[PDB]
Design a protein around this ligand. Structure first.
Ligand SMILES: *[C@@H]1O[C@H](CO)[C@@H](O[C@@H]2O[C@H](CO)[C@@H](O[C@@H]3O[C@H](CO[C@H]4O[C@H](CO)[C@@H](O)[C@H](O[C@H]5O[C@H](CO)[C@@H](O)[C@H](O)[C@@H]5O)[C@@H]4O)[C@@H](O)[C@H](O[C@H]4O[C@H](CO)[C@@H](O)[C@H](O)[C@@H]4O[C@H]4O[C@H](CO)[C@@H](O)[C@H](O)[C@@H]4O)[C@@H]3O)[C@H](O)[C@H]2NC(C)=O)[C@H](O)[C@H]1NC(C)=O
Ligand SMILES: *[C@@H]1O[C@H](CO)[C@@H](O[C@@H]2O[C@H](CO)[C@@H](O[C@@H]3O[C@H](CO[C@H]4O[C@H](CO)[C@@H](O)[C@H](O[C@H]5O[C@H](CO)[C@@H](O)[C@H](O)[C@@H]5O)[C@@H]4O)[C@@H](O)[C@H](O[C@H]4O[C@H](CO)[C@@H](O)[C@H](O)[C@@H]4O[C@H]4O[C@H](CO)[C@@H](O)[C@H](O)[C@@H]4O)[C@@H]3O)[C@H](O)[C@H]2NC(C)=O)[C@H](O)[C@H]1NC(C)=O
Ligand SMILES: *[C@@H]1O[C@H](CO)[C@@H](O[C@@H]2O[C@H](CO)[C@@H](O[C@@H]3O[C@H](CO[C@H]4O[C@H](CO)[C@@H](O)[C@H](O[C@H]5O[C@H](CO)[C@@H](O)[C@H](O)[C@@H]5O)[C@@H]4O)[C@@H](O)[C@H](O[C@H]4O[C@H](CO)[C@@H](O)[C@H](O)[C@@H]4O[C@H]4O[C@H](CO)[C@@H](O)[C@H](O)[C@@H]4O)[C@@H]3O)[C@H](O)[C@H]2NC(C)=O)[C@H](O)[C@H]1NC(C)=O
Ligand SMILES: *[C@@H]1O[C@H](CO)[C@@H](O[C@@H]2O[C@H](CO)[C@@H](O[C@@H]3O[C@H](CO[C@H]4O[C@H](CO)[C@@H](O)[C@H](O[C@H]5O[C@H](CO)[C@@H](O)[C@H](O)[C@@H]5O)[C@@H]4O)[C@@H](O)[C@H](O[C@H]4O[C@H](CO)[C@@H](O)[C@H](O)[C@@H]4O[C@H]4O[C@H](CO)[C@@H](O)[C@H](O)[C@@H]4O)[C@@H]3O)[C@H](O)[C@H]2NC(C)=O)[C@H](O)[C@H]1NC(C)=O
Ligand SMILES: *[C@@H]1O[C@H](CO)[C@@H](O[C@@H]2O[C@H](CO)[C@@H](O)[C@H](O)[C@@H]2O)[C@H](O)[C@H]1NC(C)=O
Ligand SMILES: *[C@@H]1O[C@H](CO)[C@@H](O[C@@H]2O[C@H](CO)[C@@H](O)[C@H](O)[C@@H]2O)[C@H](O)[C@H]1NC(C)=O
Ligand SMILES: *[C@@H]1O[C@H](CO)[C@@H](O[C@@H]2O[C@H](CO)[C@@H](O)[C@H](O)[C@@H]2O)[C@H](O)[C@H]1NC(C)=O
Ligand SMILES: *[C@@H]1O[C@H](CO)[C@@H](O[C@@H]2O[C@H](CO)[C@@H](O)[C@H](O)[C@@H]2O)[C@H](O)[C@H]1NC(C)=O
Ligand SMILES: [Ca+2]
Ligand SMILES: [Ca+2]
Ligand SMILES: [Ca+2]
Ligand SMILES: [Ca+2]
Lengths: 388, 388, 388, 388
């Protein structure tokens, strides 16, 4: 095995094609299936895996009551091959209420954060063993991407935040070689608040599109140089903005440099990626709620401030159905690197009160250079058929 | 690993011997087992796998109600080693309400169709990654074989249809190398309607026996040249015809060129293969319903129009028990290529109303050059012991 | 990989030590576990597997009612690593109501008999594919060992019977190379009725100890030459006889040549093996019922007619608990070939009427050259805690 | 593969970071999960496995009643990858009510003790086969570590005891090469009673920290030379003592040579390891009960009699929650050998009478040279939501 360098060009993208769906909530009504949230996908050089943060319980289980909360000592990172729902044979890779994972071409890295909110521990596990750890630097919920990290030539990078979710916080970018932290760089640039970054290789470095939970409904961008550890940051130029909540399409804006101060408080994890001067992006269809999911290309939406010229829209989840977090992962083909994304389909409390639990399923799409049609691929469980 | 060429001769066939059975409906009454339909079998160079289209639910689950329908956004292609019933650890390989899979000697190809009836997407997944996609060309339920595709020297071929199920439709043959579509040829020849082809390697090309849903109770044949992409087609010569519904044995006929216009509307997926001038074929024992299953050789039934001289009959499922789709797969031996087949054993609605679900189990037989006896290997579940 | 030749000497044996137990009936009261009977063990060069004939159902399942019967079209051969109980992820290797399996050093052979009692089919599956088949030669329940076959230099041998279970029958020894039957020899010698042979490599050939269901409570021996296909047979010399039913120890006898005509009708599968002039053997502790299980060495019990001088007794299952079939398997060590055995622990009907099903668990011991103590390792389920 | 020698230095330790948690009791309320006790962890050169002694039953099962007892013929050693809870697909490696396992770099050794209390058998299984056995030498519950053994250059060592749990007993150290016992040495030195040793490689030999069940609340140390088979022993010097029960911190003492005679009767399995003149150790937070779990370093606590100067305390399980046995395992990194530990989190009877069963989950931490925060990671099941 050799280290990945991701040195091939990005594949041509005309949109996205269906790749995977796990139906886990429908299965949970007739099977012992983990309660999860914050899923993601990452692939080793041969095959893809799904990940999520368990809640230390199956769904048809009294312990699924009041699983809406994000952080408990029972959450662990689950990992199975993609399309295998999280069943009782699934491996719990580490103790985690926040995580990121990625394969460097030779082995898996996992970054797993657990413990007290004011004094958490992040463990760094590589090739099946603990190699490093850090404690919280700001004593305010050390936390990370909830999607794949990215490794180039054996140096893996991951973005972490510690501090307020509604004010200035302290974000840092770690550089990790065979599980050992070799450098830590502070965030720099124009991004004012960065959470839950969705990162991808853009040789020779790494590019991330994140969540501003404070003043922006436009998404931050963080670029990472893995050779000299420098960082720059700004916001996606597109005037069709990617966060939820957000204003309507006519009222929304971005001009690349600053948070837009438009319904900027709160947010949802999401993604975007550049294609020349254009941007491909996903977002919820609702502007207020995590309902529906659409993708499209904004023409000149990477380079031109406030462009709203979209094309190539696809509905992934219709507006009548629940969505959730979403994130990017990248897959090496014969001659190019493709971009794919997952959508978390959240079910249960607080929004659906017929049940006491909160969980999710996933759906997953990959870039295509071919053609495609239309559809909608929601979670599909009937809340009234579920165990309470 | 090397590409398969399937260049060995067909094995000698004196009939068929038992190979596998999964008992999945009996197990579903005391276990969490997927609801399926449209199963098939395909082998990599070492071992065989069973496949089927899940319904996004287990059987003992409220979501198994009204699983008679063919297309939903929750159907996914399931894949396990042959003889492992579809349990909660089974991988959902792709999103699909129509599919075909095959191994080229180096990796698996999956062709997976999902989305809206009038604007579906087919994804082409090879070696664990999405490589290509197409949209519907006729806006009328793009669909494929529901059994294994066939690859020679790294070029895999698969037959797809789009258009009416009871009128002229548009069938195309795709040629796919490492997941990338390199050519598409239209159907040509005397076959007038082609669905759900059962294809096999017949070096140097591929031969298929299919379902005419419009005017024939005789089965179409499609031959595919993988070098120059040419296509020819006609109908199985045997006057003992392979579709259901069909007329009785004295009234039925075929003369090789045209659909017989004998109870030709509707049909069932099935198979046949040539053995010199003779044909080996399966069919339901009932002429009207998907009940029982028999195989036999028709002497000169490949070459002589309307031959009805059978020999070497075997009952696979007695006339009192349900059958379903059936299809061929091929397995390389030391010196010859063998032909095998599966039978889908459908249980539940609409025919059996004691339950609300529709599902299936499988039984599987392989060609033999040896000897054998008699038996009957039906699904075996007692409908009155099942969850509703 | 190379073919096994089993050319090392037999290990020194001072008795037997515990090796495995699956607890499957206790687990069946809180888990979805197959209903089985006729288990056995066989090892590839690295690790051991347990096998059994399923009944097409789990235990907590309405289909477990009236699973006392030996032959149905739903029975399949199950195979898992040894110590993994038969759960819903277990592979059903073939359709079988009688079977034998063995690994030749390169791949697995399975011999699987199914179909009608008067016209069964045996399939021969090697390296994952069907290679050969035969039909019944006497039209009276073609059947085989229910324990491992044995392969030397790529030639595997298996003993099969067809004909009366209470009169002269037709036994044959098949010689199978990479799944293909290359020769069939009739039984020859002084054994008058041979069923369910427990065979082991005794380089340069194979030795079997079997069940006489007609006139002997002493067990037949069949010796097989794999080079020239010749066969000889007789009966274990020990006057402590191995079958059940049998007379008491003072009344029982054997003089090596003939069935003893002592409670000879009926029987149970079992085993013995030679150690110089001595014999190591197992048997039920009860003389009438399949209750308890003991092993011991009879001094000069291989060579001296009617020797009853035992030593080195061990209780494996106390007399108060149920046993069942038992059989031998052999395991290659660094410098010697060891002998091991399993015991089927049968629970349920007809003897235990609190439940409607019949099933079993297993316990497994291996020869030792070391020391050991005493114990009893019965099934352990409480019949009153079981699903009906 | 090569034999492990463990010749690298011990890693620098600043404390411990979270590594794994299985949540098995919470899962048992909605899933078929084994009833266990006496767990441990051991790693092959690539990945870690969890082990425990099953009780021959799942938890939601009538057979889980009265599983408080330590020894039955149904207990077997379970083994899965670390973080996979013990589910129905888990392999039962051997019959055992006491065990130890370890990987020599090429294959696994298991030491498995079962049978009658007064005449037990220990089986020695290596690379999947039984290689050796011994019987009890003192006829009083032959027993072993309940945590990993240690192998250097192909010689594995394991500590065993036979005799009184409250008086002088006979402890022996066995040296085992590819499963064969090559030497047995008696305990020698100042340790007066030794049970349940937690051993680790300390090149060129092995060091163990154990449980004195008779007169010490300070833990014994046993050092083993694997070249010449010599043994020495004494007690951990730290005046902060590691057993439970124990006196309070001001009253407790140790002076390295003798059991302290301070609440010395009874005990719990636990661990400690040297770091220069300092000692890292775990213990329950309660002095009387198996409640809470803490680690810390005692400065000069390896070399200076009765040192009580602690630093670097961490709570692993808060004082309000149950703990249990604990033990060490060692993991090879790129340049150093790390020390890790597990804690058994016992639930059920006798202490918790709402249920009839006794079982456990695990939590696992590894040494770090980095930084970390605070937390508490208890079992987390609600006893009132459990099956009885
Ligand atoms: C079968 O499946 C296929 C594949 O999924 C579907 O095709 C997709 O259809 C969607 C929806 O129409 C297309 O996305 C939309 O693209 C619009 C921009 O393209 C049009 O305008 C440009 C500029 O004039 C033209 O160049 C284009 O022409 C070319 O493409 C068409 C096919 O679309 C060919 O027919 C032509 O020959 C040309 O080659 C197009 O005419 C874009 O405006 C649109 O976004 C608006 O609409 C969506 C709802 O659809 C809103 O959510 C969104 O907010 C936008 O609305 C704002 O903007 C409009 C316009 O200014 C205002 O009117 C609104 O008020 C609001 O301000 C969306 O992105 C997609 O490109 C196309 N894919 C491909 C590969 O062709 C088939 O439709 C489907 N068939 C069925 C029956 O299911
Ligand atoms: C144990 O298992 C074995 C293996 O499964 C069974 O053997 C199989 O038996 C079936 C059923 O008999 C055989 O298939 C049938 O083959 C018929 C053609 O062969 C006969 O005719 C030709 C031409 O005269 C002869 O050459 C043959 O002779 C040779 O073979 C036999 C053994 O069969 C030997 O004994 C001889 O020495 C020769 O070597 C045969 O005599 C074929 O007609 C038949 O199909 C009709 O019948 C089936 C029902 O069985 C109908 O479904 C079907 O529609 C056909 O009926 C139409 O045609 C007939 C005849 O014209 C009309 O009368 C009807 O009205 C209707 O128009 C079927 O294909 C099979 O070949 C054979 N397998 C082998 C390898 O031998 C054993 O029977 C079984 N024993 C038991 C007790 O279970
Ligand atoms: C801890 O575990 C160990 C290991 O499992 C147990 O040791 C085993 O114990 C059994 C039962 O005693 C032994 O098997 C029996 O062997 C009897 C033959 O050996 C004795 O006689 C010969 C000939 O005189 C002597 O050479 C032997 O002496 C040597 O061995 C002993 C140890 O046993 C040493 O102490 C000596 O120093 C010598 O080295 C023995 O004295 C054999 O007769 C016996 O079979 C009869 O009894 C069983 C019930 O146990 C019946 O089921 C069976 O039918 C036989 O009974 C018939 O025969 C007798 C005698 O003629 C008649 O009296 C009866 O009426 C009837 O006709 C059995 O095979 C086994 O060898 C031994 N294993 C080893 C390795 O030592 C320990 O006992 C156990 N301790 C506890 C407390 O649990
Ligand atoms: C976020 O997480 C981190 C990491 O887990 C937490 O930091 C850990 O905190 C614990 C608890 O304080 C530390 O362990 C304790 O260490 C005590 C010894 O160190 C102090 O004394 C020595 C000698 O004077 C000084 O050198 C030290 O100074 C250095 O370290 C501190 C940080 O701790 C820096 O701030 C300094 O600049 C220096 O670099 C320390 O001052 C040790 O006494 C203590 O053990 C007593 O207390 C525990 C309860 O905490 C009792 O269970 C135990 O029995 C001991 O109590 C006996 O002894 C004391 C003192 O004699 C008596 O008063 C008692 O009555 C009784 O006799 C414990 O081992 C740990 O070292 C530290 N880890 C690291 C890496 O820093 C943060 O606190 C946490 N923050 C939050 C808010 O959650
Ligand atoms: C769902 O989980 C809730 C949060 O844990 C449980 O509420 C707790 O209940 C106890 C008892 O009233 C309180 O002491 C504690 O303050 C907390 O609110 C709740 O009981 C549990 N069950 C249901 C059905 O809601
Ligand atoms: C089985 O599934 C049916 C098809 O989904 C359910 O019918 C639906 O029921 C709702 C309520 O009456 C309708 O609004 C909808 O039109 C559709 O017919 C059916 O309820 C469900 N259950 C049963 C027991 O049949
Ligand atoms: C257990 O299985 C029996 C054997 O299949 C069932 O008996 C059958 O029952 C039907 C109905 O009376 C008969 O027509 C048939 O002859 C056969 O005896 C039996 O019902 C089933 N259940 C129980 C509880 O015994
Ligand atoms: C839990 O398991 C106990 C120990 O096995 C059972 O007690 C046994 O019960 C039988 C019947 O009274 C006695 O003969 C035997 O002496 C022993 O005490 C107990 O019944 C079982 N169930 C419960 C609910 O405790
Ligand atoms: Ca925001
Ligand atoms: Ca038709
Ligand atoms: Ca007999
Ligand atoms: Ca003590």
């Amino acid at each position: 095995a050799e280290y990945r360098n991701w040195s091939k060009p990005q594949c041509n993208i005309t949109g996205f094609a269906p790749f995977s769906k796990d139906n886990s909530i429908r299965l949970s009504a007739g099977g012992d299936i983990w309660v999860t949230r914050e899923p993601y996908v990452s692939c080793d050089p041969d095959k893809c895996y799904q990940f999520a943060l368990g809640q230390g319980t199956t769904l048809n289980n009294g312990h699924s009551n009041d699983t809406v909360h994000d952080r408990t000592p029972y959450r662990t990172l689950l990992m199975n091959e993609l399309g295998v729902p999280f069943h009782l044979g699934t491996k719990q890779v580490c103790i985690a209420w926040s995580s990121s994972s990625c394969h460097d071409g030779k082995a898996w890295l996992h970054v797993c954060v657990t413990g007290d909110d004011e004094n958490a521990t992040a463990s760094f596990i590589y090739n099946g063993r603990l190699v490093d750890s850090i404690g919280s630097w700001s004593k305010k919920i050390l936390r990370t991407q909830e999607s794949e990290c990215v490794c180039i030539n054996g140096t893996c990078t991951v973005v972490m935040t510690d501090g307020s979710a509604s004010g200035k916080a302290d974000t840092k970018i770690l550089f990790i070689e065979e599980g050992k932290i070799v450098h830590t760089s502070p965030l720099s640039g124009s991004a004012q608040h960065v959470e839950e970054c969705s990162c991808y290789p853009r040789y020779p470095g790494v590019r991330c599109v994140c969540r501003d939970n404070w003043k922006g409904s436009n998404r931050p961008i963080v670029d990472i140089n893995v050779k000299d550890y420098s960082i720059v940051s700004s916001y996606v130029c597109s005037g069709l903005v990617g966060d939820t909540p957000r204003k309507n399409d006519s009222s929304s804006s971005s001009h690349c440099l600053d948070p837009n101060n438009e319904e900027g408080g709160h947010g949802v994890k999401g993604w975007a990626f550049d294609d020349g001067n254009d941007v491909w992006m996903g977002r919820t269809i609702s502007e207020k709620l995590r309902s529906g999911y659409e993708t499209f290309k904004v023409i000149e939406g990477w380079s031109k401030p406030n462009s709203k010229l979209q094309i190539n829209r696809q509905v992934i989840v219709d507006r009548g159905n629940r969505s959730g977090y979403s994130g990017i992962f990248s897959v090496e083909g014969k001659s190019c690197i493709n971009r794919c994304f997952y959508v978390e389909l959240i079910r249960g409390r607080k929004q659906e009160t017929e049940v006491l639990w909160t969980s999710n399923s996933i759906v997953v799409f990959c870039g295509t250079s071919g053609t495609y049609g239309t559809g909608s691929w929601p979670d599909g469980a009937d809340i009234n058929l579920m165990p309470i």
